[PDB]
Amino acid sequence: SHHWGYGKHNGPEHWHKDFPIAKGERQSPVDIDTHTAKYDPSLKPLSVSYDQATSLRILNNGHAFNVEFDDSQDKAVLKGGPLDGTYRLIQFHFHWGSLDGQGSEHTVDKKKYAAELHLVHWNTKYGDFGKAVQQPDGLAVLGIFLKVGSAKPGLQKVVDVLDSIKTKGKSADFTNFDPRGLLPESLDYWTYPGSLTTPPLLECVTWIVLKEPISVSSEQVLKFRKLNFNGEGEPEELMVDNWRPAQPLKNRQIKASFK
Ligand SMILES: C=CC[Se]c1ccc(S(N)(=O)=O)cc1
Ligand SMILES: C=CC[Se]c1ccc(S(N)(=O)=O)cc1
Ligand SMILES: [Zn+2]
Numbered sequence: 001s002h003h004w005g006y007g008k009h010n011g012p013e014h015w016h017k018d019f020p021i022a023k024g025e026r027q028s029p030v031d032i033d034t035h036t037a038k039y040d041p042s043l044k045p046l047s048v049s050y051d052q053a054t055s056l057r058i059l060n061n062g063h064a065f066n067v068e069f070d071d072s073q074d075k076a077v078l079k080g081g082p083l084d085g086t087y088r089l090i091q092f093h094f095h096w097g098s099l100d101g102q103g104s105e106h107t108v109d110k111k112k113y114a115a116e117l118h119l120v121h122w123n124t125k126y127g128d129f130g131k132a133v134q135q136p137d138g139l140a141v142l143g144i145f146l147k148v149g150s151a152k153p154g155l156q157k158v159v160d161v162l163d164s165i166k167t168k169g170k171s172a173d174f175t176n177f178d179p180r181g182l183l184p185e186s187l188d189y190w191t192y193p194g195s196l197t198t199p200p201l202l203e204c205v206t207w208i209v210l211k212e213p214i215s216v217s218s219e220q221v222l223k224f225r226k227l228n229f230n231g232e233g234e235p236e237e238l239m240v241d242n243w244r245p246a247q248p249l250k251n252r253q254i255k256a257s258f259k
Pocket of ligand 2: 141198
């Protein structure tokens, strides 16, 4: 069974033994060298269409928490930019640190942010998520950096439910949440071909990483850090530092949407 995690004994340096693609040619995350990334005029406009997003539930899966959506129809979709066709929102989750100076997966000129939000979408030409992850263009992940400063009002409904999903396997109703409240003002982004950042590490993702971070409060991120990796009644292991480090860029170029 799967026993990977984020500790010294089962963390990112161990993953390759059960998931050999860990050492592949298009792994994520990566460092974004801002000086080397080039404006690409071939990028069509990005279209984030979350008006009809239908959230359902929040789950602690023992690695992060997922806010899950109804993806049985095209209720919330991502299109445009580097993408061909229509990608359906399935869930979002975060990666974060034990302290504010680490937590993001992607880095920007080697700078680590306090956390990173991943809005996960699957290409509807493949019919279901499980089929999509087996294709090089199956998923689109919209990544958004979090810095600590002023509170993010649209994040607070998430923060407030976390005490009800402390431990692995716990879930709670999470209807009527609007994920548009987690975006920054600007949709300027970087994009490159990569992978899932957890096992199974499949090389199925078009990454779209927004340049502008969102600001969250220290109090908000401190609440993330009270979650547990463990299940109920087990010795407490705080859910912190659930991020994979940057991986080799290899034969890839990061493109910018902006001049
Ligand atoms: C107590 C020692 C760890 Se058991 C173990 C460790 C790592 C993995 S892996 N290759 O899936 O990350 C799988 C199983
Ligand atoms: C079979 C797939 C596992 Se579900 C999943 C979705 C997204 C990510 S991430 N961190 O790359 O956005 C990681 C894992
Ligand atoms: Zn993620």
